[PDB]
């Protein structure tokens, strides 16, 4: 009824969500040339800026994950923007995909943080200058937070895109139900829809960047 | 850009099918209106 | 190519194999990208057209849900 | 099997064997979690 | 190999001039326009194009995209061109830069 | 509206000039000063000082200590004890002095000379970071 | 603005009573190529052109339909 | 039904929790105003943090709405 | 209340130390001249 | 009816969530006052951010009212 | 009646939302006090913003009371 | 009766809204403390604003209590 | 009885309103700490205002508890 | 029983009021951090006020818990 | 059922408690903005604390959601 | 049963009270960020207070959860 835009799309009985997930990278052409067209120029510029702004903080071991993280911040971003197209199915609105993006990443990061550096890894569970009478619970709280963080990532992205698209759709329905009534009110609701669309573009970009930044900071912590 | 005179076949087909469409729309409107109000009433 | 042929044997003349369709798709991709994207002084149209086709393809599978909210009944 | 391993498996190997090992372990954990979920349904 | 200097002359960013010139001989210049308005009237009439919230969200997002283009199109275009020419000028500085070096040697 | 007077014991960089914004590294934090700023007076710590002219260009000096004062009439007087333009310095000497001071710190034990050492370290750290 | 009518006066015109003969000659040419099956010589490009102008006239029929029911979206009843 | 009724009540309750995000964004953008008024040369950089700050405040807010819908429809 | 003031210093000393640090980190092109223009000759009696 | 009753209750509840926007605008404009009192030369620029700040605070508030009406009428 | 009862409950609930305006004006006038204590020469101008700040805080508060009466009488 | 019951519930609810006035006066007098600690020469004048600030915070609080009694007795 | 039940519910609700006084005293004494850390010579005088500030925050809190008991016993 | 049920509900409600004490101690110790970072020579003295500040914040919190138990056991 | 109903009510209630985390992250990132605007040379280090601060605020928020689901599904 | 139901409701309610601890830790770590950005030489010492501050905020939060479980299991 209302969640028609989030049901796994199928066409002619075929699960066409796979094509929608595969499509974004088709919008990033590459080239072995030296001077190239405008699209690849700007896109290489953006990848350069993003890599610089993200990886810089990491040490020599962290930056090996660079290829990963940048790719991440691209994929998500493109997907999000492709969502804002009419009648489009946004695969980030699915909890499944975000779980599969988060649990492996944060997982492996905590894994490598435990394999080596195990001493300080178990010591990060305790801040530096903690007095004695409050030691035990300060461990368990960190345990819960760490052991849940991937859930936070996945849901924060999933439901955010969900609510964005759902609200845009509801205000659209409202404008529809105000088409046959006061035209100035129809224009006011339309303008609110325009502002919300702009905000949704911004929230797309920002949610991509924030998912990336959070995973990156976890990596930094466990390196 | 120099306008192009449409071949007469296409023009005549256009206007003909246009009139035929007007007729079909009117006749289907009139044919369906009674059934329309009837099912509207019988739903109650 | 088509736009030149008028014989049906051409249909069976093509390569209806996995590598064949892969190559035909790659050829189309390169032809498009080389006529509309891979040129200096390019425009934005080379990508707006792709977004348009994408909207169309989405509305396609969305039709099955959207056909239930028709305004009329006929 | 040719130009596939040449244009896919060639570049990725240093990542697929050393950089992404913990990633593979996490993938296994995520798959087991998803399987447990799909089971209890 | 170099690059062609221009694209494909797309109209409104949706239709290329190929289609227009191809329809041009038979139905002239307004043939395409009449085809478009026909097809749209059909799609919105025979319930092929249902009208719902999605239509108003579509209007909004299309309006945003068109205003964004018409506003920040020249900026990004010329910024790309600036990046390219900057790279080219620096590379030229390098060309004949090593020449003078060996010349002295 | 802003009448700026940047000076050193031996040199006058600006005088009654009209800039748009000057950024100073006050001992209680960095802050910017534009026209009509709230009247204040502060002492400096070693840091950059970027002066923005009306045109938009920026002059980036480095001051080791001194006093900034902005008054009711938007008249700013910035006196700096040693105001060097950033080019007259180098990273290697700064880093080496930083190492020497850190070593003396981890060697020293008395609060007076320890504080002296830490001040030197602060100056050198500000140096290295401010340069590049 | 007004050039729309300027082109209309050429291509958007109620066809004259003096040109129907040319149309019926085109019609008999078409039906003759249909009878003989000569359309197989027609390469696909111009065949597509013809099919598309055919869909054009078909759209003229549908717009006549919607103006004949005085309803733009479906049937009002 | 009593179930449907409690669904409505719990939905409103879980919705209450958005006041936290409201005040959070209020604080974040207020601090951004102050920090920019102090050190305007850093504006760009500051703005970044702001967005991030915002991006986490709304985060928690989202969870509330989540349960809301996850009670209103999924349950 | 900075740390050195807790140690018993004075801003004159802070300023001397900082000026000296900037004078030593000065390039040898300007180092001797700058040090000359700030050398102290006064003697307490 | 119990349904209508719960609609009213959930409407009031979801309405509670506007206190967050209230406090948010309070904070934003208070910070704007302070930041302007400090660096008045930037007034214009500062004001911009304020509006934006406001524009997001009311944002969250809107969502609350949304559910309110989206329960009061749409459901 | 259960309807009248729920009207009373929803009225009290929607009334709760005035705490946001209360805290908002509190913050605004506190910030005005601080900003004036720091740059008193701008007092007049500052006061203006304060009123405006206030004028929007009460704004949101009003909406709450609105629903209140719009439930108590109009419904 | 269910009516009397809902009167009690709505009374408690509308009473909740005094927390806003509580926090508002807290903020106002805290800011007064700071502003006086910074520019004590203006103490008198500052105090004035404080009272006014207070006088509006309690204002909103009053409205809450209003509905409270206006439900408890008048209805 | 339903009356006694609603008395308990309304009592808990009206009790909720003490969070405002809690945060208010928190803010007041925090500001007192800051203001004293700045201008300690005024400590005595500052403390006075603090008490007064406190004396009004608890004030509003009291009202809440008032209704609480004025529902629990008087009604 | 409905009485026991309402006792549980009112207990949870009256418990809600501890959020005020939570935020109050948060503010107090945050201000103590700032005030010490400014004027560390006064640390000892400052700490005193902090405790006192804390000692009143928890105060109000206590009252909440009071009613809680004074409903859970005494009633 | 009355049990399912109370599960929904308690879920919404326990969800309310996320407003605390919302305001907490708001405060943390606002303070980060200010502290960076004051001493930008420490940006990196400051950011660390911010994350940690955030990491505990969300912590408490989590507990709320915990009970929520631990009532919605486990009970 | 109605008893089990009210146990769930009261559990969610008592859980709400963790928002206070959430905001409290938010404030504490925000103030720590600011105080360190001001006087970084005291970092170590400052951090100590932070932990202590945190150690009391979570304290109150604990009590909430306490009643929660002390209702969910012990009662």
Swiss-Prot record, chain C:
Membrane-crossing segments per the record: 49-66
Alphabetic keyword roster: Acetylation, ATP synthesis, CF(0), Hydrogen ion transport, Ion transport, Membrane, Mitochondrion, Mitochondrion inner membrane, Phosphoprotein, Transmembrane, Transmembrane helix, Transport
GO cellular component, as recorded: mitochondrial inner membrane; mitochondrion; nuclear membrane; proton-transporting ATP synthase complex
A biological-process GO annotation: proton motive force-driven ATP synthesis
Compartment annotation: Mitochondrion; Mitochondrion inner membrane
Membrane topology value: Single-pass membrane protein
Subunit composition and interactions: Component of the ATP synthase complex composed at least of ATP5F1A/subunit alpha, ATP5F1B/subunit beta, ATP5MC1/subunit c (homooctomer), MT-ATP6/subunit a, MT-ATP8/subunit 8, ATP5ME/subunit e, ATP5MF/subunit f, ATP5MG/subunit g, ATP5MK/subunit k, ATP5MJ/subunit j, ATP5F1C/subunit gamma, ATP5F1D/subunit delta, ATP5F1E/subunit epsilon, ATP5PF/subunit F6, ATP5PB/subunit b, ATP5PD/subunit d, ATP5PO/subunit OSCP.
Family from the record: Belongs to the ATPase F chain family.
Protein name: ATP synthase F(0) complex subunit f, mitochondrial
UniProt source species: Homo sapiens
Gene that this sequence comes from: ATP5MF
Swiss-Prot record, chain E:
Positions of post-translational N6-acetyllysine modification: 95
Superkingdom of the organism of origin: Eukaryota
One function term, GO molecular function aspect: proton transmembrane transporter activity
Main subcellular localisation: mitochondrion
GO biological process, one term: substantia nigra development
Record key words, sorted: Acetylation, CF(0), Hydrogen ion transport, Ion transport, Membrane, Mitochondrion, Mitochondrion inner membrane, Transit peptide, Transport
Cellular location(s): Mitochondrion; Mitochondrion inner membrane
N6-succinyllysine, modified sites: 87
Transit peptide as UniProt keyword: yes
Cellular component aspect of the GO annotation: membrane; mitochondrial inner membrane; mitochondrial matrix; mitochondrion; nucleus; proton-transporting ATP synthase complex
Purpose: Subunit b, of the mitochondrial membrane ATP synthase complex (F(1)F(0) ATP synthase or Complex V) that produces ATP from ADP in the presence of a proton gradient across the membrane which is generated by electron transport complexes of the respiratory chain. ATP synthase complex consist of a soluble F(1) head domain - the catalytic core - and a membrane F(1) domain - the membrane proton channel. These two domains are linked by a central stalk rotating inside the F(1) region and a stationary peripheral stalk.
Protein family: Belongs to the eukaryotic ATPase B chain family.
Protein name in UniProt: ATP synthase peripheral stalk subunit b, mitochondrial
The organism of origin for this protein: Homo sapiens (Human)
Gene responsible for this protein: ATP5PB
Residue numbers of the full-length protein present here: 45 to 149 of 256
UniProtKB/Swiss-Prot annotation, chain F:
N6-acetyllysine, modified sites: 100, 129
Any GO molecular function: structural molecule activity
Location (main, coarse): mitochondrion
Modified-residue entries (N6-succinyllysine), positions: 100, 129
Gene Ontology terms describing biological process: aerobic respiration; mitochondrial proton-transporting ATP synthase complex assembly; proton motive force-driven ATP synthesis; proton motive force-driven mitochondrial ATP synthesis; response to copper ion
Its job: Subunit delta, of the mitochondrial membrane ATP synthase complex (F(1)F(0) ATP synthase or Complex V) that produces ATP from ADP in the presence of a proton gradient across the membrane which is generated by electron transport complexes of the respiratory chain. ATP synthase complex consist of a soluble F(1) head domain - the catalytic core - and a membrane F(1) domain - the membrane proton channel. These two domains are linked by a central stalk rotating inside the F(1) region and a stationary peripheral stalk.
Protein's name in the database: ATP synthase F(1) complex subunit delta, mitochondrial
Residues of the full protein shown: 37 to 168 of 168
Swiss-Prot record, chain I:
Annotated keywords: Acetylation, ATP synthesis, CF(1), Disease variant, Hydrogen ion transport, Hydrolase, Ion transport, Membrane, Mitochondrion, Mitochondrion inner membrane, Primary mitochondrial disease, Transport
Single Gene Ontology BP annotation: proton motive force-driven ATP synthesis
Annotated GO CC locations: mitochondrial inner membrane; mitochondrial matrix; mitochondrion; proton-transporting ATP synthase complex
Primary site of residence: mitochondrion
GO terms of molecular function: hydrolase activity; proton-transporting ATP synthase activity, rotational mechanism
Annotated InterPro entries: ATP_synth_F1_esu_mt, ATP_synth_F1_esu_sf_mt
Domain of life of the native organism: Eukaryota
Residue numbers carrying N6-succinyllysine: 20, 31, 36
UniProt subcellular location: Mitochondrion; Mitochondrion inner membrane
N6-acetyllysine PTM positions: 20, 31, 36, 43
Expressing tissues: Ubiquitous.
Disease field: Mitochondrial complex V deficiency, nuclear type 3: A mitochondrial disorder with heterogeneous clinical manifestations including dysmorphic features, psychomotor retardation, hypotonia, growth retardation, cardiomyopathy, enlarged liver, hypoplastic kidneys and elevated lactate levels in urine, plasma and cerebrospinal fluid.
Entry's family note: Belongs to the eukaryotic ATPase epsilon family.
Name of protein: ATP synthase F(1) complex subunit epsilon, mitochondrial
Organism: Homo sapiens (Human)
Gene name in the database record: ATP5F1E
């Amino acid at each position: 009824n209302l969640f028609a835009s989030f049901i796994a799309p199928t066409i002619l009985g075929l699960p066409a969500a796979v094509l929608i997930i595969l499509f974004p990278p088709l919008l990033i052409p590459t080239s072995k040339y030296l001077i190239n067209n405008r699209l690849i120029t700007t896109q290489q510029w953006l990848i350069k800026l993003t890599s610089k702004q993200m990886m810089t903080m990491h040490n020599t071991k962290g930056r090996t994950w660079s290829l990963m993280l940048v790719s991440l911040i691209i994929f998500i971003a493109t997907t999000n923007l492709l969502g804002l197209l009419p009648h489009s199915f946004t695969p980030t609105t699915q909890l499944s995909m975000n779980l599969a993006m988060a649990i492996p990443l944060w997982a492996g990061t905590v894994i490598m943080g435990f394999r080596s550096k195990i001493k300080n890894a178990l010591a990060h569970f305790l801040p530096q200058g903690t007095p004695t009478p409050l030691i035990p619970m300060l461990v368990i709280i960190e345990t819960i937070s760490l052991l849940i963080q991937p859930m936070a990532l996945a849901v924060r992205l999933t439901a955010n895109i969900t609510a964005g698209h759902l609200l845009m759709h509801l205000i659209g329905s409202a404008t529809l139900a105000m088409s046959t009534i006061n035209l100035p009110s129809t224009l006011i609701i339309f303008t609110i829809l325009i502002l919300l669309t702009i905000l949704e573009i911004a929230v797309a970009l920002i949610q991509a960047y924030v998912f990336t930044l959070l995973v990156s900071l976890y990596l930094h912590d466990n390196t | 850009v120099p306008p192009v005179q449409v071949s007469p076949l296409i023009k005549l087909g256009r206007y003909s099918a246009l009139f035929l469409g007007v007729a079909y729309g009117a006749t289907r409107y009139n044919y369906l209106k009674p059934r329309a109000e009837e099912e509207r009433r019988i739903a109650a | 190519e088509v736009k030149l042929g008028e014989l049906p044997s051409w249909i069976l003349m093509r390569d209806f194999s996995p590598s064949g369709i892969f190559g035909a798709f790659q050829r189309g991709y390169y032809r498009y990208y080389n006529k509309y994207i891979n040129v200096k002084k390019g425009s934005i149209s080379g990508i707006t057209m792709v977004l348009a086709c994408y909207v169309l393809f989405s509305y396609s599978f969305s039709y099955k849900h959207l056909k239930h909210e028709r305004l009329r009944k006929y | 099997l040719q130009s596939i391993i040449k244009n896919i498996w060639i570049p990725m190997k240093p990542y697929y064997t050393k950089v992404y090992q913990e990633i593979w372990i996490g993938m296994g954990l995520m798959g087991f979690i998803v399987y447990k979920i799909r089971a209890a349904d | 190999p170099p690059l062609p200097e221009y694209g494909g002359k797309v109209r409104y960013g949706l239709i290329p001039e190929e289609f227009f010139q191809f329809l041009y001989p038979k139905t002239g210049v307004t043939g395409p326009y009449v085809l478009g308005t026909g097809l749209i009237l059909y799609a919105l009439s025979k319930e092929i194009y249902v009208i719902s919230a999605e239509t108003f969200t579509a209007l909004s997002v299309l309006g945003v995209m068109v205003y964004g283009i018409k506003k920040y199109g020249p900026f990004v275009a010329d910024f790309a061109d600036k990046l390219n020419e900057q790279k080219l000028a620096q590379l030229e500085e390098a060309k004949q830069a090593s020449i003078q070096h060996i010349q002295n040697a | 509206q802003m009448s700026f007077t940047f000076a050193s014991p031996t040199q006058v960089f600006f005088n009654g000039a009209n800039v748009r914004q000057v950024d100073v590294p006050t001992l209680t934090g960095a802050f910017g000063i534009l026209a009509a700023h709230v009247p204040t007076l502060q002492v400096l710590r070693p840091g950059l000082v970027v002066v923005h002219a009306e045109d938009g260009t920026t002059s980036k000096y480095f001051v080791s200590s001194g006093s900034i004062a902005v008054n009711a009439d938007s008249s700013v007087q910035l006196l700096a004890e040693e105001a060097v333009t950033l080019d007259m310095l180098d990273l290697g000497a700064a880093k080496a002095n930083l190492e020497k001071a850190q070593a003396e710190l981890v060697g020293t034990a008395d609060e007076a000379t320890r504080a002296e050492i830490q001040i030197r370290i602060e100056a050198n750290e500000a140096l290295v970071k401010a340069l590049e | 603005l007004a050039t729309f009518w300027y082109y209309a006066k050429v291509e958007l015109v109620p066809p004259t009573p003096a040109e129907i003969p040319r149309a019926i000659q085109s019609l008999k040419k078409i039906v003759n190529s249909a009878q003989t099956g000569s359309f197989k010589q027609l390469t696909v490009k111009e065949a597509v052109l013809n099919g598309l102008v055919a869909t054009e006239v078909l759209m003229w029929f549908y717009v006549g339909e919607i103006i004949g029911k005085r309803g733009i979206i479906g049937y009002d009843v | 039904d009593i179930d449907t009724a409690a669904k409505f009540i719990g939905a409103g309750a879980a919705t209450v929790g958005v006041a936290g995000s409201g005040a959070g964004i209020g604080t974040v953008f207020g601090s951004l105003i102050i920090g920019y008024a102090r050190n305007p040369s850093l504006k760009q950089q500051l703005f970044s943090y702001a967005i991030l700050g915002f991006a986490l405040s709304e985060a928690m807010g989202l969870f509330c709405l989540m349960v809301a819908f996850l009670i209103l429809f999924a349950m | 209340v900075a740390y050195w003031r807790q140690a018993g210093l004075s801003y004159i000393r802070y300023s001397q130390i900082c000026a000296k640090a900037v004078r030593d980190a000065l390039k040898t092109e300007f180092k001797a001249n700058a040090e000359k223009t700030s050398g102290s000759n006064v003697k307490i009696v």
